[PDB]
Amino acid sequence: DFLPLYFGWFLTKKSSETLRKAGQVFLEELGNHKAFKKELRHFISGKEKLELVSYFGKRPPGVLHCTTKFCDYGKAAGAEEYAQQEVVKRSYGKAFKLSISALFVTPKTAGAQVVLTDQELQLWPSDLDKPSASEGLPPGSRAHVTLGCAADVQPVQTGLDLLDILQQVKGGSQGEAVGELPRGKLYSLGKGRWMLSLTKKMEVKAIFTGYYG
Numbered sequence: 001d002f003l004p005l006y007f008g009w010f011l012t013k014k015s016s017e018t019l020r021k022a023g024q025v026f027l028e029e030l031g032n033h034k035a036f037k038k039e040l041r042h043f044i045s046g047k048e049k050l051e052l053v054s055y056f057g058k059r060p061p062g063v064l065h066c067t068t069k070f071c072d073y074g075k076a077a078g079a080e081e082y083a084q085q086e087v088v089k090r091s092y093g094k095a096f097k098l099s100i101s102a103l104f105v106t107p108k109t110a111g112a113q114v115v116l117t118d119q120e121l122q123l124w125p126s127d128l129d130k131p132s133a134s135e136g137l138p139p140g141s142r143a144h145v146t147l148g149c150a151a152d153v154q155p156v157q158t159g160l161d162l163l164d165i166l167q168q169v170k171g172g173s174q175g176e177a178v179g180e181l182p183r184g185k186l187y188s189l190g191k192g193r194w195m196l197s198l199t200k201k202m203e204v205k206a207i208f209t210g211y212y213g
Contacts, residue, residue, distance in 0.1 A: 003074045003083045004210030007123075008067040009096055011145070015204035016064040019100065019112060022183070023147035026103045026196055027052040027110060035178040035188060043107055043192040056110045056148025058155070064145050066098055066114050066206065069125040070156075073212075078128055087122045091208045096120055100145065100202040102184075104165055107192040108150055109158040113166075114143040115201070123208060133163045141166055165195055 011019065030036050031052040036043075040050060071079035082088065098120070102113040116124060124140040134142055146158040168174060168189050179186035187195040 003071040003079055005072060005213045006067050006070045007082070007088065007208070007210050008065045009098055009120075009206035009208050010211070011064045011066075011098075011204050011206045013063060015206065016062070019064055019145060019202060019204055020147070022202060023103060023110060023112065024053060026181070026183070027056065027105070027148075029181050030105055030186070030194060030196075033179055033181075033186065035186065036194065039188065039192070042190065052105065052110070053148075055150060057151060058149045058153075060146060064147075065211070066143055066145050067159075068123050068208075071210075078125060081128075082125050091123055092210070094208050096206055096208055098145075098204050098206055100198070100204060102198060103147075103196040104162060105194045106161045106165075108153045109146065109155070109161045110148040111158040111162060112145040112147060112202075113162060114145060116140040116143050131160075131163070133160055133167070136170065137163060137166055161193075165189060165193055168193075169195075 031050055037049065040047070044050060069079065069082045070076055071083065074080055099115045100112045101115045104111055104113065121140050124143065142159045142163055144159055144162045146155045149155050149157065174187045174189055174195065177185040178188045181196060184196050184198040187197065189195060
């Protein structure tokens with residue numbers, strides 16, 4: 001009896017359209033921003049302008065999601081232990097509201113930061129060999145929605161990318177906002193990394209369930 005490929009919160013059609021459009025507008029605004037344009041060298045080693053919607057060409061086709069535990073049908077470490085928790089079984093098929101606090105972009109991925117409630121944090125995995133990228137950071141900090149990936153990148157990168165962006169804000173290194181977009185303040189973390197802090201947290205609805213490929 002096998003597990004899904006992964007468990008996660010799957011956004012409603014409506015919420016996915018909303019966040020998807022938010023991400024795309026952000027990519028069109030970021031790519032046109034003069035602060036971004038003057039840093040293109042720290043972005044692509046390739047003078048004309050980069051179109052980020054095109055740059056992030058591998059995108060989710062339909063509904064968006066926030067992954068909790070990648071299971072690979074039970075091949076992944078901790079997959080069974082995770083799937084067996086009462087809270088997971090109990091939460092299966094239930095609606096949740098997810099709060100997105102920021103949109104981000106690196107040379108590798110574009111995504112949205114999810115800020116989990118403590119209830120939702122109960123559905124966040126407690127891995128038995130923790131990532132040194134994750135470590136130092138409050139649990140669930142890795143929670144995100146993938147918006148796009150560059151050609152050579154696997155969408156699991158997005159999470160590592162977000163933890164990286166946050167490792168720096170932990171060291172108070174985000175620095176001074178270099179711009180004001182209609183939705184929030186634009187931060188340049190360097191190394192091709194960008195973060196938009198939303199003035200107002202987007203709220204999205206999603207169903208907690210398992211995806212089987």
